[PDB]
Every structure is written in structure tokens, then in C-alpha cells.
Amino acid sequence: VARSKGYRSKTRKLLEKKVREKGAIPKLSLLMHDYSQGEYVVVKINPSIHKGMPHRRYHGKVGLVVGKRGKAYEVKVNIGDKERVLIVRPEHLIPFN
Amino acid sequence: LKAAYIREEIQIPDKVKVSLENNVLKVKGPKGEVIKDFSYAKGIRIQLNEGKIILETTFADRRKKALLYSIIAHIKNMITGTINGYRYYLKVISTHFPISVKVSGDEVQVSNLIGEKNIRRAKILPGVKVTVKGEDIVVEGSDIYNVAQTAANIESSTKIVGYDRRIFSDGIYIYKKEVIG
Amino acid sequence: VKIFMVRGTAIFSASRFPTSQKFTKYVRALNEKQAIEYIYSQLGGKNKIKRYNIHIQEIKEVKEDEITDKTIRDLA
Amino acid sequence: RPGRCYRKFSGPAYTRREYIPGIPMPKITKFVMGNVNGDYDYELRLITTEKGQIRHNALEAARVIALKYLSKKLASEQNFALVVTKYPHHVIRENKMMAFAGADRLQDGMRLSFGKPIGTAARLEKLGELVMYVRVKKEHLEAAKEALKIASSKLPIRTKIEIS
Amino acid sequence: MNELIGVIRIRGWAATPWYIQDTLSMLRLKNAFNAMIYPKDSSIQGMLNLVSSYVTWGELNDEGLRLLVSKLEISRGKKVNEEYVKDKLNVDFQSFVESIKDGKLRLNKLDEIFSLPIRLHPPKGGFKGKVSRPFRAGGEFGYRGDKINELIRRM
Amino acid sequence: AIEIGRICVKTRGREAGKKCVIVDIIDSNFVLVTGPKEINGVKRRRVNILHIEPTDKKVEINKGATDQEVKQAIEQSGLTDFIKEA
RNA sequence: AGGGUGUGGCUCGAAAGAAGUGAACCCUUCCGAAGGAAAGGGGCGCAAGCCCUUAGUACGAGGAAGGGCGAUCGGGGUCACG
RNA sequence: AGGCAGCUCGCGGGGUAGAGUGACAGAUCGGGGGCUCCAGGCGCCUGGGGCUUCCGGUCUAACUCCGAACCCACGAGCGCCGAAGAAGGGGGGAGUGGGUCACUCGGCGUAAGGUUGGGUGGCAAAAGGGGAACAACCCAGACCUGGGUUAAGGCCCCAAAGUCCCGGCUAAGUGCCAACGAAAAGGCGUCUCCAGCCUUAGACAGCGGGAAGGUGGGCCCAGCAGCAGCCAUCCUCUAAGGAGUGCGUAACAGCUCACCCGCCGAGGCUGGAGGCCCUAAAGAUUGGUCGGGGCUCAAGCCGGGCGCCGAGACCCAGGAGG
């Protein structure tokens, strides 16, 4: 039985959040800091926020700030031997290291 | 366990001479004399003391120690016959037909049983005397084994009663044994 | 001759019982090296116990006039 | 069906009733016998040795045989108590379709060969897990030994006893 | 834990898992009966652990090192313009330690820095000298302390 | 016979046929022997019972005697030189 | 069963291949790869053996010189046995 | 002129193994306390019904308050390849889309040389040595000739080398089998090891006696005169005895059981586990085995050990080709 390729398929706990941080977006402190080109970021999807949700296929990875469009940022990530760009709102980005 | 060094002695009774050689034992006594071989006592050394029997061995197993005592019992039994006579007893009980037995040299014959016209026979080992007085059979001899196997041979012959009949306690049977004489 | 005292651990499915009918033995030997072989010799084959799970705990010498067993005693 | 058919494990557990319709009712209904809360002294338990699954059918039979042996011994309410530990949470499933459909040229063979619920088992996952146990006084351990042991005669797997 | 470490490969290069086959290649252990020396560190430690079931490694001694080095031949030399020259004297050093080394113009003074793959000889009397399977842990494959020194002395 | 006081000859090992004297028993099949002034010098050590051959000659000694003691005892029997009598 | 293979036996060998300007065959001397002894000596181990020495020595795959002998070898066919 | 099939460090991601269920969702066993209703019996008690609380236990692929090993991202470092033989870009030409098996973690199904997944390895297209022969099992990647050393395995003969050593065990030819070939139970048959209880203030066993009496108490019972159906129980007593065990008997009677004494001077007895072995254990395909021969203080097994043979793998020498 082939599984449906739903955009959130097979995520029964990928988008589950530890109960200690439920509710509306707590971490305003992370968002307020601004990125510039060449910065390195880590993607951590917030299941609560329905805006600009990146696909699960690139979660928990290393990202590079290559530019800015609108309220959101675009991020370059290597997955295989190719290149890809992920345009995302900042509320799933945490600085590296 | 492991029996380390077990030693036993046999005090040879008087009026007896004992000869030992080539791991072959012979005992002479007033009642009689029989030669008994003991070449099969591997792992056991036999010392013939001038006035007793010295038996020693080192580090015997569970098997050997039973063997050693087993050897011991026969030798004194060998001694016992040469001094005191072995007298097995065979008592005969019959229900409907009286039982008759006669001696034939080294062979025994019994007939007039519960109705069968056939003959029954048993073998007697050489050098063994067996007689009948009445209602009882006397088995004489020095060697303890010789009489019993001879006595048993009679017992097998008279066992034939046991086919598809509940046993009628009829035939030749062992009574007692070993009068002091 | 320096009788020896051996008390060691050997296992299949937790066969530890530091007392006297499922765990350990006595030994008569000259030195430790000859003595240590004997426990390997017996327990190795007498009960299918590899030297893997052999763990000697205490090895020492007892004095020749006090051993609870007489069978080991009289053999001198 | 023979007990050798379900001794080992064939796949994961099988537990969710709401996901698995129509489970045949297990044979076992009573799990505790004797005067619980009664005063007992000997504390013997029962231990298993190898892994596996035990059909409830045998267990219920094991339940009955244990009771009668004790019941004839002293009484049923007397100074003893029998409690079986495990429960038939696990469920077995068998492709029975080869019986009915296996003689009418219907979809026979391994075709659609998912199992069908016919029985339940008390699952064993730990080496040396409790199965049942009995509590008595000092004066009746001797009757309790075989009492567990006779029950163990019917269990599919090798068992062990102890004294406490 | 000392700086000077070495390794010998005893297994062939067939039936070699993808994990490891290139590691010895990355460890320049193209095929069994080969060696070289490394500065010990946690970074090296990973390979030896991962390749343990195929090789034998440990800490050298002076006796082993001097014996080990003395084997470089017509086709077993330093990275002196390739050519694997036969060292055979300070002469090859004297004209060619002036490239990467500094101050090492003595045959004895090679106790610091680096080397290349070397083609070994079979262990004398059988690698199964007292062993029979080459796959016992603590005895056969991996780390053997100073004992690797005698093991190579047999080589 | 195999008991203390017996003089035997080694079978295997580097000895391979020199004198030896039992001094004490040890186990099932190890015993204590020594050679007082054996022409090579027999080391006072354990020996497997299978690795000696019992000859006829004997010595009268006390259990666990020292090498000098047997070195001294062989004169009583004269075996100081009579080792090679058989 | 078959063929290739080693040792042989018996056979054909005019030319076409070697070869009397030396084949084939014997010695003697020399060099020597890796590799690699033994007797004896001493010591150790219950033993089975090892350790240093004898020694990388004798030995050795390969290659060089001399001599003595004196004409077939290489080659083809079959067969015996491995 | 960097590149990255590995590792280390740093820095992140994770809900799986496991574990818990009073942390949700369910599943599920019992007891205790209190409240409530009903039935029965004499306001009380008993049983049953519902509710609550407390205490205890049993499970979860579609439960997760937690949660590894582990795997993955990126940076730096190590390490390796690189201008003799070169990150990226372009271009010509293909075959390949039925795999299989071994190991390992799954699912389905009991199962399957079944099928269907994850990872690795051959094989396919991989000779050479062993496993008896052999696609896949282990060793190990064949330019050639020659020499030597070695691997997996083996070393009584076939057939190269050990009738090699120590210690111990097996009596069935059990066995002499990695990939393959017997379950539960029974065995004090044997061989070693843990407990517990009596033992020179005389142990077990063995051999004779006292081994008993009001009383054979007895209840109903002709009689049960322990032992017909329920059961108590005192001194005459002491180095010894019950108001008493099994045979028994219509009822007895009687023989014994329980206890001491006389000899007795070494251990004895009961639960425990293991190794090997016996039963369990029965198929012919036609005919008897571990390969056979044959092997039994082993030519088996276990603990170990010691020494060798063994290929084309490796070393060397000579030639050859890219």
C-alpha cells in the first residue's frame, strides 16, 4: 500500500510539541534579532505557526542567509549533491553553534 | 568424591592353605577347594600376606570401590565354603499331582507335573552335589555360586507353570540355605 | 608441598554460590601457577565452563593441621 | 489447533481492540482464588525460562487443575490463595480462509492472507517473568510444590519454581 | 598514550565492507602486509576502532621502529619525487630531507613526523604462531599494546 | 612399586633416561622427586607419574626429605655409585 | 573416458633445428635473493618444547668460471605408472 | 586548486529500542474504607446492585510524562587524491529496467530452498584452497615462469604434516557434522560442583529387647477392642514408648509404626544446578556408518596447551605488456 504524499504526511510526532511550551509563540526574543547575508542558521519548524511552514524534508538542518524578501528570509541548504533555496518566515530559525 | 587410598585385610582362618599366582587364586579347605580367577581386577593390586590377605588401591572411582568390596565378599565366601558347607533348600509344593525327581549324573529330571507328559531338565555345574530326601531337595557344595546357579536351573525348569494361568504356587521352589555345617 | 586454598567465580546463568556444593573447590599444589591450572583443568571440562567466566576471587595457603575435610587430610 | 502453532513470535504484538474487531472471548474469567488478605507464611512464586506466548486455553485449563488439587487438599476458602499474574492481552490471528474458501476455487492461497482473530495469549517479554503464584503457611509448602508443578505440566514453555 | 603509533593489515581486500574498504585506502593500507606511522590522537583513534576487525595496531618501541624503517627498498621509499627509492643510507636523506623536514639529516632522527606506505613481509613461523583464528578480540584484531613490537620483530 | 623411597628413571623431557628418586606424592599424577648429585643434576620439582619407570632399588627416608638428606641417604644403601647397577 | 603434465621403456630421426669452431654428460671453484637449519653447550618448563650460542653460518632459487669426457641432443609416435 | 567515500572535536536534529501508565488515550485484575439502593434473615446482620476514596498488579503498531545506543546536518581539525595521471562545463557511443542467495533488523503469514522491506556481502561476470563432490561458507582478487613464507583448514591411512602433551569425562560406535541432523519429561546412570538437617555428648544403616498399661476409655455401635462415620485426651512413667502408624479383623487377636537401651566408630541424609550419556526416538525410497577405512586411559568430547603441513594471498628473482 503506497502512502499518500501529503505535505505533512508521516509526522505524528514531528509536529508534536512538548507540553511545556504550548500556546501562542513564546520566543519573541529569537525573532527580533535580524539576519544578514552570510549568516548560518538552524531550521526548527514551529508546528503552531501556520505561516511559511517549511516542508518536513529539510527540518533540523544547517541554513545560510543569502538574502531577504519581505517579512521572510530565504535560506540555502545542501541536501544531496544539489542546491536549494527555502523562503521562510524567521519564526523557525535559530542561530547556529 | 575420590577414594584416595583404601586398604582392606582378610584374616585367613586356620586349617586353610592359600596359593596365589598369575593373578589366579586357589583356596584349599577341609570341605573342599576351588580355583577362582581374578585376572579381571584391573586397577586393583592383590598382595597375598603370609597370614592374611592384603588388598590395596590408590584413587579409585565410584565404580572401582564397589568392585573392590565386590571382590572382597567373594573371597571370604570362597573361604566360607571351604570350612562350612553350603546347603540350599528347595521345597516342592504340588496341588493335584505329586511331583517326582531323580538324578541323572550331572543332570536333573522332573516330571509328573500338573498334567503334562513331557520331561523337564536342568543343568548342574561340575563338582556340585545335590540330593533329595522328600518334599525337599538338598544342594551341597563349597562354591556358593555353583549351587545357586544349579539351584536356579531347577527353578527355571519348574517355572513353565506360568502361561495364561494365574500362578498355582505349584512346582519346585527355593526353601532356605546355608546350614552351619 | 604448600597446600593451596582456591575460591573463584565461574558462571553459566549466574552459578555463583560462595559456599561448598555448587561454586568452588580445594587444591593441593606447589605454587600458584601449577595450582591455577588445576581449577581450569577440572571446571573447564567437568561442567562445560570456559575460562571466560572463570574469575578467581581469593587464592592463598592453608596450614597443614586445620582443614575441615579429612579426605584431603589423610592422603598425605 | 496444536499448541506448537503459536509458541514463537510471528511479528509484533496485537492489542488495540478498537482497531481489531471481533475478539473471541478468552476462556479465563476468574484470576484470583482463595482467601486473599488471609495470613500466609510461605511465599513461593513461579518463574518462566524462555520467551514465547502462552495460549489462554491452556492457562484456563491450568487454572482449573490447580484449584481442584488445592480444593481437595484442605478447602477452597482455607489458609491458601491462588492468583494468576498475566492477562491474555495479546491476540492471535490465523488465515482460516484456507478452510472455507480453500475448497471452492475462491481467492485461495496466500492471497489476502492476513490473520483472523480466533484466540488470545498472555504475552511474555522478560526472561523470568511471573505467571502465577500461591501463598500458604509453613505447614503446607510440600503440597504447594507439585501444586504449581502439576500446573506447569500443561504449560507450553519450560518453567521454574522457587521457595520464599 | 604515546605519539608514535603503527598498524599492520592482515586481511585481504575482497569481502571487505564498504565502510572499511576505503578507510584502509584512506589509511593507505591498500593490501595486507603494509605499515606506516602516525601521531596518536582522538582523530586517528576512530579509524582503528572502525577498522579493528581487519588490522592490528599498537604503540611502537625503539627496537621495532628501527627494525620497521630498515626495510625501505628500490620500490619502498619516502615520497622523494615518488620513485620509492631504497633508502640504504643517509645519502638519500642527505640530498632530500631538505623539502618538508628541517634538521633531520640523520637516519636515527626519524622519530617525529611522517612516512609512506611500506610493503611488509609475512610474519615468521605463521601469523597463527599460537593463534588459529585471526578473529579473537584482545588477542587477534586491533590493539595489542607493546606486544605489537615483538609481533613486528617476527616480521 | 610406586611409593616413597623408590628410585626411578625419567622417560620424557630433556632427561630421557637418567636416575631419579621419589621424595613425596603430590596429587593423582604429579609427585615430588629430586636427584641429589645427578650427573646433570635433577631439579627438585614436580613430575608426572607417567614419566618415570619404577626400578627395583629403594631408599629408606623420611617423608619430604631434603636433597642433601637423600644425598646422604644413598650412602646407607651404597647407591651413591650403585645408581647404574641396572 | 585424454588432455596437458613428471619419470621412464621402446621406437623414427635424409634435409628442413642445435651441434665437432664442442652436443649431451660428469666433476671442481666462485657469487648469491628472500628465506632459512642442525649436532654440541647452558638454562627454563611435569611433559609436549622454547630461549642465547653455535649462525644469517652450512644451506640455498638463480648466475659465473674452469677443467675431464666425448657425440648425439632438441624434436615425432606409442605404452607403463604418478 | 581544490575535492571528499572516513574519523575526531565542537555545535544541532530525533521519539525508535527500553521504560511508565495517578501523564493523556484506551485494555485489564483484586482488596480496603465510606456513601447509596434492593433481596433475605433476626433496629441489626448477611448477600447482591450503583457511586466514591485509598492501596496492589497485569499491556499497548496505530498511548507517550520520558528516552539511549544510534543515524544524520554544518564548521574546524585530522587523513587521503590532486597540475605525470586535474574541482567544474560540453560532446560521441552504449547495455542495463525478470535477480538470487548468505548474514543481519522487520512485515505478512505458524510454516516454506515462501513472499514482501532496511543494511552488508558475494554470486552473477570471480579462478585459485578447504567444506566429499558445489553459483553463493570461510581464506583470498589469477601479466607469465621459478623460488620461498604464509592464510581458511587440517596434521593415523587413503593424502602433507602429531598415533603431539596435561588434566577430566563419556560404553552408546552416543560420537567422530560450523553453514546440518530431535522437543517436554523421566534417570542418584554416571562426573563435578550451592543450600538445609543430624553426626565421637557416639550419625545413618544394620542387629535383639523394652516396643507397654487405667484403656480395648470411648459416641452412637452385636463389635469396630487406634485404622465403621466426628474427635479429645490425662499419669503408671522413664536410659522407654503415643489414648498409637500401615497391614489388618464381622469383631478381635496379632505383626508393626513412634521412642530408648545393648554393639557401631565414619560420615549420613533432604531440596539445587550443570556436563556426558539412556529412554523418549518409528519408515521404507533398492543396501550398512563419521567420506570411508576404521577408532573406545580415543583417531570422541571439554578445559587448555605445544609443534608442523598446507595457495596463484604476501616476499623475491627473471621475462612481458599498458
Add this chain to the structure above:
RNA sequence: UUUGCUACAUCGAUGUCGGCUCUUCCCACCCUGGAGGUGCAGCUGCCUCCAAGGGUAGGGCUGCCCGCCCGUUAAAGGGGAG
């Protein structure tokens, strides 16, 4: 021994049920031999064990197999060998 699945082998054929004749095998023994227990007075029983050397029919209905039955016999054993 059938019967369920497996598709590894056979689709440029391994010719398919039964029966007839004929040979052989196996033992989980039907009888015959040996031994025993029995709720075995004896016969008849019932059951266990060993034992495959030999034997183990003739008919009716049914094409069979199976099955039902007739009258004797020691019984009228069951399976294999494509």
C-alpha cells in the same frame, strides 16, 4: 502414506485414473513365535513389550478408491517404490 500452500525443475511432451501380471521394500505386528500384566477358576477375553522369517484369501453391489454386505479362514494389516 492423502489432503492444504510453494512455484525451484519439466510447456521444440517425463503420455493422465483404475485394474491385470510381476518384483521388492518398510514397520506404526493382522496372524503366526517369545515374555508379561490383568477388575487372568479354565476357555474366551483386554492390554504392554520384543520380534518383518513366512503367510495374510474367495465372492456380491460400485469402473474405481472408498463404502455396505455374504460364507469360510489365522487373520482376511497398513503403507512405499515417478
